[PDB]
Amino acid sequence: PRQISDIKQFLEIARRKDATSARIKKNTNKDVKFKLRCSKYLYTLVVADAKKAEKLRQSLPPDLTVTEVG
Amino acid sequence: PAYLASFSHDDWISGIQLTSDTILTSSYDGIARVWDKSGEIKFQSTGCGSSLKSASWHIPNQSFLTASLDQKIFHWVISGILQTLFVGHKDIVERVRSLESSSVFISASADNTVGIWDFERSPEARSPLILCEGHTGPVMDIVFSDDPSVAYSVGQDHTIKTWDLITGQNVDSKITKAPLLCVEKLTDLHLVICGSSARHIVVHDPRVSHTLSGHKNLVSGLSASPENPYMFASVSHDNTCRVWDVRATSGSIYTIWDKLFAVDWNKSIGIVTGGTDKQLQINQ
Amino acid sequence: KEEKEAKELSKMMMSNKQRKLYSKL
Amino acid sequence: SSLSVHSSGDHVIIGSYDKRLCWFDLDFSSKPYKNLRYHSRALRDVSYHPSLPLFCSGSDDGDVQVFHGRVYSDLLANPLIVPLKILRNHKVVDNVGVLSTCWHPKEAWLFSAGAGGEIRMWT
Amino acid sequence: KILKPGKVALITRGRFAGKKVVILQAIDQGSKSHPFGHAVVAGVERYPLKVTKSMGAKRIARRSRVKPFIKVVNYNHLMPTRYALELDNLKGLITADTFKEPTQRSAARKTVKKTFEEKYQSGKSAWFFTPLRF
Amino acid sequence: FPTRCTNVFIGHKGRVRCLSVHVSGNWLASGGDDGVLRIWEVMTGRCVWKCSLIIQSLAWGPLSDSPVLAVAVDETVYFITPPIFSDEQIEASKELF
């Protein structure tokens, strides 16, 4: 219920203490959806390029619990 | 060197070339007054159509090239008669150095290039014989090194490139932390004194650069005194000609909103300096 | 040059109106 | 008042009549990444050097603020914005000071135009 | 001609509705940016508070501080009055450029403030400085 | 280190509203309320182009081969190619429009 179009701020909310988990979604149309469970909202970020998605994934801090497609 | 006399000019003295007898002074008004030893203007360039940039006589009382803002260098044969005009540079020729032994003379231009204009071998209105390129920024000045086939070139790219006119390429490009504005090669010390925009004159070994500060503003031109090989004068934008010494690297040995632009050092006429003051002064 | 730069190096991160306390006193 | 764009295309400076400089990073947030209030009077123009990571803000107070804005493409490294110099000693005429500032295409040279007809070369 | 420089008028529309202003300059012919008969005015946003003989000097100054505003207003939105205010020191300060560059607008606001402060202390234009109740 | 100013251009009798530098970097075109367009060269600081021809703003073209500067005066914009450049620049600037 919160769509994020800014990569950094998605990262910063991920670093924020309210963040509990992150999820990866790989759609058939080949876009990557980074969803970040927070305390109050779920912030999702849509990226159209695979390598930007991959560099984003490794940019997530290690302490965050990342989960693959459900 | 006590000041001898000053000769007035129509505009600021863009270029100065002091010989034993002839003294070429190119001004921003588009004229190149060939002042004598006493100061008598033998001839002045006419019909240039653009502001003169620099003057360089191949020999006294002989052909003398004078570059203008129109990217053209006219060779007046001393009264001076324009035998031929070398044109073809993309931008205005920032400075020109005369070569007596070789017909090809180097000329640094604002187009980030150095053209070797020839008296007769130029592609004639005469394209330079060897339009050397490679400098990232505009080539501020070019001075022939100890060898007649090589010439140091300083420019806005902060890199002094030793371009070989025979090969047309820079053998070695010494990069500095400041953009060099003037270049003058001293064969006696086998060095090249480069006046950077940081008001510092760096004497770099052609074969490594000793920096000397003290100028109030950016150095505009340099010329080693024939009387003392270790002594070299440098006219800066502060309208001052700081005469420093290689041995005395701690500032200028004896320095002599105007801005000095051109400086030359002839043995007979002494040190000739000119700039925004529109008066070419001589210190003997 | 360094002391002057530190003077205008006050781009936030100093909490809310705290450093002037010590500077004034 | 005025805006400038980093050659990378992901950074914008906003010079404002509120005596404020706002650095916007397009992948950072919709809000300004940094807000700076060093100028004591209304800010007129902001200019970014096309190549070097240096930018300047010219205001009517007569002072030109020269800042070093460093940008990496790495996500972990936020751009480093630091002041570098405070150019002063420029007169103010009719409550108008440094109105326009321009950067040299290659080196760190500043073209500043005043209200008195003076063009200063900050090298 | 009843909208002349130095004439006190009332703003009837806008944020400053019901505030008393003085006609600073009339451009009734019109302009490119304002094709109507506008007139630039200077007025009061926060009227100075009432003062008492029992009040101390610090509060007398504290209440006497007045916050002005400069605005270009349409003729139809201005209500001219019979009162006139002598705009000394306030003849040449406003121009199209003074609005274009807010630095001149800020300077104009400060000069208008200091003139209004001094005039209020001088005790002239009592009606101009008292708020209009509606 | 953009240190203290060392070169001052003077000659404008009023406010210089806008100034721009060509891609080559050797030409600086400035204008203001006086309406006088002045072209300066940074190396020596002369004002070689004194021709005046209020100046809101002016900016150079991005193409080095076509050095055309656009000046906004009131509601009018002029595309001026000064003859200070080499002739081929003048021909190269024309075919853009």
Q: Is A56 part of the contact surface with chain D (CB cutoff 8 Å)?
A: yes
Residue ranges with strand state E in E13-133? 20-26, 38-46, 67-74, 78-84
| Token pair belonging to D67 | 């800042």
Backbone angles phi, psi at E59, to 5 degrees: -70, -35
Orientation of helix A7-15 relative to helix A50-59, angle to 10°: 30
Q: Is C2 part of the contact surface with chain D (CB cutoff 8 Å)?
A: no
| Token pair belonging to B9 | 């000019």
Backbone angles phi, psi at B135, to 5 degrees: -70, 130
E62, containing H or E segment: helix E57-64
Q: What is the C-alpha to C-alpha distance for residues B51 and E7, in angstroms, rounded to an integer?
A: 61
Give me the total of CB pairs closer than 8 Å, taking one residue from chain C and one from chain D: 13
Taking the C-alpha atoms of F86, F87, F93 and F97 in order, what is their torsion angle to the nearest 10 degrees? 170
β pairing state of A2-3 and A42-47: parallel
Would the CB atoms of C5 and D84 count as touching at under 8 Å?
yes
Q: What is the C-alpha to C-alpha distance for residues B266 and B270, in angstroms, rounded to an integer?
A: 5
Place of tokens 């008028």: E9
| Of residues B226, B253, B229, the one with CA closest to residue B241 | B253
Q: What is the C-alpha to C-alpha distance for residues B176 and B163, in angstroms, rounded to an integer?
A: 17
Would the CB atoms of B69 and F45 count as touching at under 8 Å?
no
Give me the total of CB pairs closer than 8 Å, taking one residue from chain D and one from chain E: 15
Backbone angles phi, psi at E6, to 5 degrees: 100, 0
The CA–CA distances, whole Å, from B53 to B96, B104, C14, D14, E80 equal: 9, 19, 55, 41, 68
Looking at the DSSP bridge assignments, the partners of residue D2 are D15
Tell me which chain D residues have a C-beta less than 8 angstroms from the C-beta of E107. 95
Documented resolution in Å:
3.1
Q: Do B97 and B106 touch, CB atoms closer than 8 A?
A: yes
Q: What is the C-alpha to C-alpha distance for residues D111 and E86, in angstroms, rounded to an integer?
A: 45
Length of chain B: 284
DSSP B197: T
The CB density around residue E118, as the number of other CB atoms within 10 Å, is 12
| Of residues B129, D45, B179, E92, the one with CA closest to residue F43 | B179
Sheet holding B130-133, edge to edge: B93-96, B104-109, B113-118, B130-133
A15, containing H or E segment: helix A7-15
3-class state of residue F15 by DSSP: coil
Place of tokens 């390429």: B169
Would the CB atoms of C11 and D36 count as touching at under 8 Å?
yes
**DSSP3 helix / strand / coil % (chain B, rounded to 5):** 0, 55, 45
Looking at the DSSP bridge assignments, the partners of residue B87 are B72
Q: What amino acid is encoded at F3 in this protein?
A: T
Give A61→chain D minimum CA distance, Å: 10
β pairing state of A65-67 and A21-26: parallel
Q: Do B192 and B234 touch, CB atoms closer than 8 A?
A: no
Taking the C-alpha atoms of E50, E54, E57 and E58 in order, what is their torsion angle to the nearest 10 degrees? -70
Number of domains in chain A: 1
Q: What is the C-alpha to C-alpha distance for residues B178 and B193, in angstroms, rounded to an integer?
A: 14
Measured at the CA of B138, the angle between CA B132 and CA B142, to 5 degrees, comes to: 55
Q: Is F84 part of the contact surface with chain B (CB cutoff 8 Å)?
A: yes
Looking at the DSSP bridge assignments, the partners of residue F55 are F73
Q: Is D121 part of the contact surface with chain B (CB cutoff 8 Å)?
A: no
Longest CA–CA span in chain E (Å) reads: 54
| Of residues D87, D56, D17, D119, the one with CA closest to residue F15 | D119
Q: What amino acid is encoded at B25 in this protein?
A: T
The CA–CA distances, whole Å, from A26 to A8, A35, A37, A62 equal: 21, 11, 17, 21
The CA–CA distances, whole Å, from A61 to A56, B153, D107 equal: 10, 52, 38
Q: What is the DSSP string of F24-90?
A: TSS-EEEE-TT---EEE-TTT----B-----EEEEEE-S-TTS--EEEEETTEEEEE--TTS-HHHH
Q: What is the C-alpha to C-alpha distance for residues F23 and F83, in angstroms, rounded to an integer?
A: 17
Taking CA atoms, what residue in A is nearest to D32?
Answer: A9
Give me the total of CB pairs closer than 8 Å, taking one residue from chain A and one from chain D: 20
| Token pair belonging to F65 | 């081969």
DSSP B185: E
Q: Determine the structural domain holding residue A37 and report its residue range.
A: 1-70
Q: Is B148 part of the contact surface with chain D (CB cutoff 8 Å)?
A: no
The CB density around residue B216, as the number of other CB atoms within 10 Å, is 13
Range D21-43 burial, b when 16+ CB lie within 10 A, else e: bbbbbbebbeebbbebebbebbb
Q: What is the DSSP string of C3-19?
A: HHHHHS---S-STTT-H
Sheet holding D100-103, edge to edge: D100-103, D110-113, D119-122, F5-9
The CB density around residue E30, as the number of other CB atoms within 10 Å, is 11
Q: Is C14 part of the contact surface with chain D (CB cutoff 8 Å)?
A: no
Backbone angles phi, psi at E87, to 5 degrees: -90, 60
Orientation of helix E102-122 relative to helix E57-64, angle to 10°: 130
Q: Is F2 part of the contact surface with chain D (CB cutoff 8 Å)?
A: yes
| Token pair belonging to E124 | 């002239």
Q: What is the C-alpha to C-alpha distance for residues B3 and C16, in angstroms, rounded to an integer?
A: 64
Q: Do D46 and D57 touch, CB atoms closer than 8 A?
A: yes
Would the CB atoms of D27 and A6 count as touching at under 8 Å?
yes
Would the CB atoms of B110 and F26 count as touching at under 8 Å?
yes
Neighbors of chain F with 3 or more C-beta pairs under 8 Å: B, D
Would the CB atoms of C9 and D82 count as touching at under 8 Å?
yes
Which among F12, F21, F28 is the nearest to D117, CB-wise? Answer: F12
Q: Is A16 part of the contact surface with chain D (CB cutoff 8 Å)?
A: no
β pairing state of B150-155 and B139-144: antiparallel
Q: Which residues contact B94 (CB under 8 A, 6 or more apart)?
A: B53, B54, B108, B109, B110, B138, B139, B140, B141, F43
Q: Which residues of D touch A (CB under 8 A)?
A: 25-30, 75-76, 78
Longest CA–CA span in chain F (Å) reads: 43
Taking CA atoms, what residue in C is nearest to D21?
Answer: C11
Tell me which chain E residues have a C-beta less than 8 angstroms from the C-beta of D96. 101, 103-104
Q: Do B267 and B225 touch, CB atoms closer than 8 A?
A: no
| Token pair belonging to B228 | 């003392």
Q: Do A10 and A36 touch, CB atoms closer than 8 A?
A: yes
Q: What is the C-alpha to C-alpha distance for residues A16 and A14, in angstroms, rounded to an integer?
A: 5
Q: Is A2 part of the contact surface with chain D (CB cutoff 8 Å)?
A: no
Range F55-67 burial, b when 16+ CB lie within 10 A, else e: bbebebbeeeebb
Contact between chain C and chain E (3 or more Cβ pairs less than 8 Å apart): no
Q: Which residues contact E75 (CB under 8 A, 6 or more apart)?
A: E3, E28, E36, E37, E38, E39
